[PDB]
């Protein structure tokens, strides 16, 4: 049934003009079909006819939907819907059921065929013209034209939400204690009335949108709790993760290991645990998208544990605006945590996990830093406020990293959680020089274009050595002079560099990076018991 | 209430702002709700449909000495987008020497005045709702919006007429009006000062508006010399420390020279090697105390270019800023303190920092510089608006500091004993 409510002017990208596509030829079945269909969304109202005044076109289709050997249709508005305008945004991003409160009660109404409920702005349905056309292409083809929002159409969406809102605002207005939330063409409807009641609310909102021509579903279906929505199993009380079937097979394919790598990276948000770096191997070198790869044990093993973590299915619970917020952190390995939001402790409402990518340089700390803050934009975005922080590291070592750090950083309010292992300070350069130990001036050179070097250094001890290098640059060659200093050194150590690039580690003191060679110099940072670093301008006198 | 309006139009080619709504927490989406539904009875804006695609961003925020939330809007792009302009707003050079200076709150003045219909559109804002449970509450404004540049653009005239009497009146203050604000300076101490700003304020209120320690003190910020250190007896240490710092600082002063030190430098000795300095070293170093005891000359302010602000973190709650506009051609410098309090937070320290050295930028030019930070993004749009007190927002890019760049101003000099 069409509305009596306002039409949302609408307009066609800047400067451009309705869709003017040919239409197909069709069977006398699947055209016989379209004439009866329209007839009738014509009787309704829905469509109307249209002469030859109107230049444009939609290709209409005719395909029998599934599980009716009855004919419905389909109108092709790709075209039109490149050159309408823009609105702004239908689906945000999608809620989270974490940030959900539990509902005594949840019913859903499908406002289905609404889009057909709510009409379309009179100026713009010109350009939704289509055509029915005839056995032997005789003269005319039976033309329409939507006078209601199509299905299909780029708008449609928008329109039919921002028209909604409106028609439930009086009913939203009078009843403060039910919460509705419109997501596609499904009103979902919650309270904590007693169940009488809302049963009673729920009939009186069905007769409210009645008002207005959007019919509501027969007995005969309805849906009802849980809900499936994308992903989880939503109960008014509870929600559940939806089941995770891993296919067991006989032979595998590149592509169906891409496949599979991917939805046990869905998977590990939730179930931390999930692993597969040999899952991954069988790829390197993989010439087809369906060339068969023999599983390595090693991936045997993994693709079974994993099987065994998704079994233990997973519950977590709703939010409860009168508790705090509780966010839990835990390095599992160099570059990865895992986290935890809770209100009651083991009552989860959400989990996931970080691989972070070594990239240029950075240290545990500067990490956990990012952790936090990755948490603490999502706790924004779902519950408005941010979580109290329970972290594995030390408030000494965090005031001694942080106070002297060469960017500004930050934690929301936490607090120490002594829950191995914890992040720490893997060394840390002295501020002066050392009394009683070597001192190291290092240096390194390499040809640009012939990429040949020479790496070495001499002591104020008398010391000294040199390495000729092939196939080498020249950070490589000043780093190299760096690592040989630090070999040969012993447990104190005084180094002396012109190196651009120990300007970088003496401020960033970093405790990994993406160079093999970095990290060969920061393991050996790591070993030594004191270690001070410094810089001299380069091609001064300084030696 | 509205009157004949001026349109407004966008620089040619331009098309709306289209800018993301950042997430906000629980507690400003409620104070943004009440102030919008207020708003909205006042006629000051209306809700919008989904056929209008253009948005800018939107917060709240408190001032110091306010526990009441006020509304703050991100015109950043529209005010890029918006067309140049009879009054137009000439920047004086007065306040720049005055011996105190007031910044009063005249936002509330555009509110009064109606904007054009068609570049209402450009103006539409949302206020998003927690987990997306609901859609956003689009609005848009019809009057004149607090923080864009059209704004005391079209209010130009009525706030001369508005003002002339006090200025006629007192020739011996200065008045500079820059968006939401108003410097107001003067020599007189601050008995006079205080007291005729407050009369100031009356001469406002009485036309409507409400418009409200805290004074400032222009040239007192000097720009200060950088000092070397000096010792008994010198280390290989502090010599390489010191040669390094002056053969970068030859690139602002080329007359700078650093061959006799790096002399006494030649030879692998230890570093906690004390080394005396040869008598021509001792002159060379003389020499560049010198050249260091004043400010390059040569460094000349231009109206069009862009005004450069760039701070470093030192460390202990300390942090050093300089403007240019060519790099190593610096208009000013200087050492910031945290703030009583900050104690445990960076973002905090540096957000305050950001709205000094903006406001003196503004005293001094009447321009906002484009801010270079030593912070990352993310850590900065997460909570810079937490402490955010002004109704401008400044322009910012996110860098990476060199540690040499940071060792050379920790040297700059500081009072003896203090200010007291
Ligand atoms: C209150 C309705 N509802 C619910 C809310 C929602 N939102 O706010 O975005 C999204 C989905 C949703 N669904 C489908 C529910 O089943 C539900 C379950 C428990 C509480 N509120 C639930």
């Not at chain 2, 005249?106 to 206020?127: C, H, M, N, Q, W």
């Amino acid at each position: 049934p069409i509305s009596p409510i306002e039409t949302v002017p609408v307009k066609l990208k800047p400067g451009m003009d309705g869709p003017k596509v040919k239409q197909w030829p069709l069977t006398e079945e699947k055209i016989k079909a379209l004439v009866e269909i329209c007839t009738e969304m014509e009787k309704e109202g829905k469509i109307s006819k249209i002469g030859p005044e109107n230049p444009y076109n939609t290709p209409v289709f005719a395909i029998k939907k599934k599980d009716s050997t009855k004919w419905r249709k389909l109108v092709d508005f790709r075209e039109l819907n490149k050159r309408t305008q823009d609105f702004w945004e239908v689906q945000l991003g999608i809620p989270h059921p974490a940030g959900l409160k539990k509902k005594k009660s949840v019913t859903v109404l499908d406002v289905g065929d609404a889009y057909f409920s709510v009409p379309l702005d009179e100026d713009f349905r010109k350009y939704t013209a289509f055509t029915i056309p005839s056995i032997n292409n005789e003269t005319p083809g039976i033309r329409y034209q939507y006078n209601v929002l199509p299905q299909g159409w780029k708008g449609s969406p928008a329109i039919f939400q921002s028209s909604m809102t409106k028609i439930l605002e009086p009913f939203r207005k009078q009843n403060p204690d039910i919460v509705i939330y419109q997501y596609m063409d499904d009103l979902y409807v919650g309270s904590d009335l007693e169940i009488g009641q809302h049963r009673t609310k729920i009939e009186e909102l069905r007769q409210h949108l009645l008002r207005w021509g959007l019919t509501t579903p027969d007995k005969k279906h309805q849906k009802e709790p849980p809900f499936l929505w994308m992903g989880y199993e939503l109960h008014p009380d509870k929600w559940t993760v939806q089941p995770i079937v891993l296919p067991e097979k006989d032979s595998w394919t590149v592509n169906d290991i891409q496949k599979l790598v991917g939805k046990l990276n869905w998977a590990s948000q939730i179930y931390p645990g999930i692993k597969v770096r040999q899952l991954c191997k069988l790829l390197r070198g993989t010439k087809a998208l369906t060339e068969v790869i023999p599983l390595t044990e090693e991936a045997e093993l993994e693709l079974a544990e994993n099987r065994e973590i998704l079994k233990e299915p997973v519950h977590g619970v709703y939010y409860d605006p009168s508790k705090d917020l509780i966010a839990e952190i835990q390095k599992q390995g160099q570059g990865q945590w895992t986290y935890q939001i809770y209100q009651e402790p083991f009552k989860n409402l959400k989990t996931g996990k970080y691989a972070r990518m070594r990239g240029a340089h950075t240290n545990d700390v500067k990490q956990l830093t990012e952790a936090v803050q990755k948490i603490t934009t999502e706790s924004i975005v779902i519950w408005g406020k941010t979580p109290k922080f329970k972290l594995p590291i030390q408030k000494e070592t965090w005031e001694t990293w942080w106070t002297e750090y060469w960017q500004a950083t930050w934690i929301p309010e936490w607090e120490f959680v002594n829950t191995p292992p914890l992040v720490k300070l893997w060394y840390q350069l002295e501020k002066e020089p050392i009394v009683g130990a070597e001192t190291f001036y290092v240096d390194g050179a390499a040809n640009r274009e012939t990429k040949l070097g020479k790496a070495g250094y001499v002591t104020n001890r008398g010391r000294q050595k040199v390495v000729t290098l092939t196939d080498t640059t020249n950070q490589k060659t000043e780093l190299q002079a760096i690592y040989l200093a630090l070999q040969d050194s012993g447990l104190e150590v005084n180094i002396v560099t012109d190196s651009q690039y120990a300007l970088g580690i003496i401020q960033a003191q970093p405790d990994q990076s993406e160079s093999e060679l970095v990290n060969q110099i920061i393991e050996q940072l790591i070993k030594k018991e004191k270690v001070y670093l410094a810089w001299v301008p380069a091609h001064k006198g300084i030696g | 209430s509205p009157i004949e309006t001026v349109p407004v139009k966008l620089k040619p080619g331009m098309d709306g702002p289209k800018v993301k709504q950042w997430p906000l927490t629980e507690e400003k989406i409620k104070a943004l709700v009440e102030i919008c539904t207020e708003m909205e009875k006042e006629g000051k804006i209306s809700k919008i449909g989904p056929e209008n695609p253009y948005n800018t961003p939107v917060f709240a925020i408190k001032k110091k000495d306010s526990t009441k939330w006020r509304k703050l809007v991100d015109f950043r792009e529209l005010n890029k987008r918006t067309q140049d302009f009879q009054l137009g707003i000439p920047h004086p050079a007065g306040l720049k020497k005055k011996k105190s200076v007031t910044v009063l709150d005249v936002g509330d003045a555009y509110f009064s005045v109606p904007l054009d219909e068609d570049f209402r559109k450009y103006t539409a804002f949302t206020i998003p709702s927690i987990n997306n449970e609901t859609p956003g509450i689009r609005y848009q404004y019809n009057v004149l919006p607090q923080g864009w540049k059209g704004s005391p653009a079209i209010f130009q005239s009525s706030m001369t007429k508005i003002l002339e009497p006090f200025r006629k009146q007192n020739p011996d203050i200065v008045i500079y009006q820059y968006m939401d604000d108003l410097y107001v300076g003067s020599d007189l101490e601050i008995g006079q000062h205080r007291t005729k700003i407050e009369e100031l304020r009356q001469h406002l209120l009485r036309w409507g508006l409400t418009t409200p320690g805290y004074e400032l003190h222009p040239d007192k910020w000097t720009v200060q010399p950088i000092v070397l250190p000096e010792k008994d007896s010198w280390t290989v240490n502090d010599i390489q420390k010191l040669v390094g710092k002056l053969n970068w600082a030859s690139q602002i002063y080329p007359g700078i020279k650093v061959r006799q030190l790096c002399k006494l430098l030649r030879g692998t000795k230890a570093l906690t090697e004390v080394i005396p300095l040869t008598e021509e070293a001792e002159l060379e170093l003389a020499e560049n105390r010198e050249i260091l005891k004043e400010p390059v000359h040569g460094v000349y302010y231009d109206p069009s270019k862009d005004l450069i602000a760039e701070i470093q973190k030192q460390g202990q709650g300390q942090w050093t800023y300089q403007i240019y506009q060519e790099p190593f051609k610096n208009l000013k410098t200087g050492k910031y303190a945290r703030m009583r309090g900050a104690h445990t937070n960076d973002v905090k320290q540096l957000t305050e920092a950001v709205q000094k050295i903006t406001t003196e930028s503004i005293v001094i030019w009447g321009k906002t510089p484009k801010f270079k930070l030593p912070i990352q993004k993310e850590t900065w749009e997460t909570w810079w608006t937490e402490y955010w007190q002004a109704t401008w927002i400044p322009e910012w890019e996110f860098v990476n500091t060199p540690p040499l760049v940071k060792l050379w101003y920790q040297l700059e000099k500081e009072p003896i004993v203090g200010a007291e």
